[PDB]
Amino acid sequence: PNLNIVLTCPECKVYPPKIVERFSEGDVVCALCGLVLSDKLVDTRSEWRTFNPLLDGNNLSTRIGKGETTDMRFTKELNKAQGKNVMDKKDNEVQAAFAKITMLCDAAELPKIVKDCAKEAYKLCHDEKTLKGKSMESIMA
Amino acid sequence: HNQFECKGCDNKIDIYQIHIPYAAKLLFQELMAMNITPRLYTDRSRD
Amino acid sequence: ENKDMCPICKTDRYLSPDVKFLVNPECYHRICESCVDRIFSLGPAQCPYKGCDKILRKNKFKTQIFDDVEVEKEVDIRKRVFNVFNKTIDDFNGDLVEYNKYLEEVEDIIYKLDHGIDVAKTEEKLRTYEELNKQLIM
Amino acid sequence: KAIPKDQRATTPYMTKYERARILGTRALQISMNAPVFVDLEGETDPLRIAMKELAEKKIPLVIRRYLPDGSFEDWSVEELIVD
Amino acid sequence: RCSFEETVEILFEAGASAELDDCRGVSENVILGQMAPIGTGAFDVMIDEESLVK
Amino acid sequence: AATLQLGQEFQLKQINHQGEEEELIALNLSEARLVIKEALVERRRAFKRSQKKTREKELESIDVLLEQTTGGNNKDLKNTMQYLTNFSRFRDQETVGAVIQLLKSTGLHPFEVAQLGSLACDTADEAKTLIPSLNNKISDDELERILKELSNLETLY
Amino acid sequence: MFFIKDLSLNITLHPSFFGPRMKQYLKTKLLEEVEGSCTGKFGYILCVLDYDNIDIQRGRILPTDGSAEFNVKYRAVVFKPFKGEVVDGTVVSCSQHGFEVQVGPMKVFVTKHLMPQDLTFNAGSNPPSYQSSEDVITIKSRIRVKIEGCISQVSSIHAIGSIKEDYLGAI
Amino acid sequence: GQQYSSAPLRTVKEVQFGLFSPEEVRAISVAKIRFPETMDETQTRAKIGGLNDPRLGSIDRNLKCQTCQEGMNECPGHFGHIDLAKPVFHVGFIAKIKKVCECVCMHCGKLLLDEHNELMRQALAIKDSKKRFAAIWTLCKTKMVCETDVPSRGGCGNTQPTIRKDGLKLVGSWKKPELRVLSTEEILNIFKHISVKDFTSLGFNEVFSRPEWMILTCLPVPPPPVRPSISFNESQRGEDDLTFKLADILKANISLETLEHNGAPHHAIEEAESLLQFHVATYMDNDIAGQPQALQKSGRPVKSIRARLKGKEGRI
Ligand SMILES: [Zn+2]
Ligand SMILES: [Zn+2]
Ligand SMILES: [Zn+2]
Ligand SMILES: [Zn+2]
Ligand SMILES: [Zn+2]
Ligand SMILES: [Zn+2]
Predict the structure, then answer these.
(1) Does H74 share its domain with H108?
(2) Strand G43-49 to strand G68-79: parallel, antiparallel, or no bridges (unpaired)?
(3) Are strands G85-95 and A36-38 parallel, antiparallel or unpaired?
(4) Which of A79, H35, H130, H311 could staple H50 via S-S, CB 3.0–4.6 A?
(5) CB contact, 8 Å: B26 with chain E?
(6) What transmembrane ranges does the database entry give (chain E)?
(7) CB distance from F16 to chain G under 8 Å?
(8) Cα(C3) to centroid(ligand 4), Å
């Protein structure tokens, strides 16, 4: 429902926003009357400094491993709990398939581009109806 | 349209405006995310 | 009765019967509180008491200790007509014959009203009420 | 709760902080087109005009000195002995 | 107290025990971002309308 | 609602600016016009003091002479004067004093007597239906009598 | 209802208004803002009684900007609607959902569903009028409306009325 | 440079610190957040009802933040929530709750000893709340049996067990020896049976703090104005660590509800309950001693709120 902010100059109002963005001053200004359109400009490079949608999608997950000061009993109970919830999603085949495909590509000394193209192809096929089997070896080859 | 509300306490009249730094607002929102209430009052109830 | 007191709330004995059951004088039908309040609150309409069509008005209710609709109507009309006739030519001099004859006429009027006859004599009794009221005003 | 004039027991001398805020607020008002009570000798800077008004006690202000118990006093800058 | 060292523990104990702050401390007025009662701000400046007619 | 339970600022207990206790002042659409039209006169005297150094035509003309006094930002008060005047049947503060004498004689709430004096009714059922707070707090014959004396106090102006 | 209440307002003045006559300015502002405006807590403010004995109290200086703040206590005549309140009014605008009654400074709306069944909407007339079985509701016609609910928004108050019940409708 | 507002401008004076009640959390929040996914299925906009939906705050300037409208330079943010089907404990209160478990009966919910004891009479005269709770704890932690009749009193009598902290849990030891682990629902029930004089004698204020409120039931969800995500090159989008923690809380909560809906293996229910307790515990404080440390998929520990409020050069 709308939610689209469009910057316009109320003094000029003669054309769609043909503006200039001053990053050093942190403003955006109309290149005609010289009137600023917005102050306090946000950055995208600065938030990126601390840090894959193409393959993993929007799914999120976090690992549980052992801690600095912890017991080995709690590490097993948390991993066994995830082992019971691993059936909630059918994405175990993508990680194992990409693992074995990773082993074969690393065994063939092929570049990473062919690895990403092959993983993308297997992601395009995945589990469709026209495949109807092939025992996971033929779709990988 | 000059309209205000506060969810969960039935107010549409008595709304106060305060100027605080954005970092302090980050502190208050992190306390609310940590189940801590940083209630702010413009009047002195203790006197 | 314990099985009929509101067409929607006919059995509220196991729901803690804490609501009263009002009766409109133009319907003589039992309606519980939460229903009648919405009835006259949304507008003066008729109650669906077994397909009742007489309009239920706002307020003007009454508490009933239950003495049958016949006797309740006969005592309401009895008191109303008793107030319309008032004490005209009653204890004016001390006569017993004409007094008892006039009381017989009044009770016969109340009888014709509680029976209705054919909706013809009762209208003449209404004109008699207007005449008696005109005599009381003067 | 406003101590009366016969019970004001604070220092009658204007401190450097009171003189500072009086010259700052007065100069800020003069910068915002305030009625000047002293004839100018050709000044243009607002702070110099504020100090010119303080030198003749023509500043129309009164200080509300807060006491630690919650009370306060009203010492006008005209009756305060400067320097 | 929370500003100096152990922030989270002091805050948690505060919220747990329903503690109230007077908010005339130095760091408190700093955090909220308004004038503190120190020096110039330790007194309010008023106006006397009876002095304007002088 | 209309169950003698108004808001906080509209409660029966009010406090003036001096600190004393005062009952809620409820006005009907009779003296409410003479109070606005009244205070606007002394306001005109106050505007002409510092300057040194049939029933509808007079209403709108006086509303124009008072509109020149104000800064042209309160015409809803003048349209409210036309509303009240078009819905008012009372006149002169003496008769209004008599009306208050008839309303306070029953011992009712100020809002109730305001709704009594502000509405034109002929029978008691009209006053009991238009005013849900009054249905058993006062006798019907007394209300009919008040409507009779009021009917003798109203005059076509 | 037309009530009288003592209200208090904080007036802000620019440092350029600190002349000896500033009190007058105060009253001036105290009129220009209060008379005619509206509040969601006290209703539509009509007039302001007592113009000579207006208390000024003491003016305080807020930090930045140097503007002056005043707390004024006065007596004023205001108009506040109430829920379930029988009032009278005259129609201004007409709509298929109902005609908009004008009660003083408030424009009450009456929903078509809150009207009796005999009252029907007529658009073929100029202006469109609501014709019933005996009464014809037009713009210049006077109608007694029973207000059912009121909304108290800040500086804006609208109410909803009805005429379905008895002793209501056109006057 | 922000937009003008007609609200009265005042300074900030008194600041009150209190616990968040679950009812107030549900009254402040606007969304439920059920989908652990970040963005929508079409790889654009937002998930609408997920970890970062338009019902919360937004960044990127261009977006309007549905429920405030205006912009990101004006949006304070908006709060979501998470309604759990199993109550969990808060890290910073695990000790305090334990102390409460050593200050009140575990059945009738009444304070140990009574006002007839002289030491309790002396301890109640202290005006400081923390010292009162300390001394009263030192007295009540020794007596391990409620009593019905005390010579110059409530009933019960049931032997009060010994509460020990172990793996974010509280195990109760009965000598009678019968050792049983105290669940969160039982402790919360006993806390629901606490009288006013009891917790107010411990240092709680009814309008601000409650022992029932100390046990976490509903969880507030902070808006992206607190955890700003990034979309770099439109194909390298990074989400904050708290977002991943919320995804873990959602997966563990939905998993626990699914395991508790159909059947009951009794062991997978405890594994999923300890899993949700671990995700909430690491969400509040990841650097908890005696517990495993959650690590991100990049190779770095998960950044929690406590880490933002603890180390130097942080928020303070
Ligand atoms: Zn729409
Ligand atoms: Zn421009
Ligand atoms: Zn019923
Ligand atoms: Zn019926
Ligand atoms: Zn927002
Ligand atoms: Zn016990």
Answers:
(1) no
(2) antiparallel
(3) unpaired
(4) H35
(5) no
(6) none
(7) yes
(8) 17
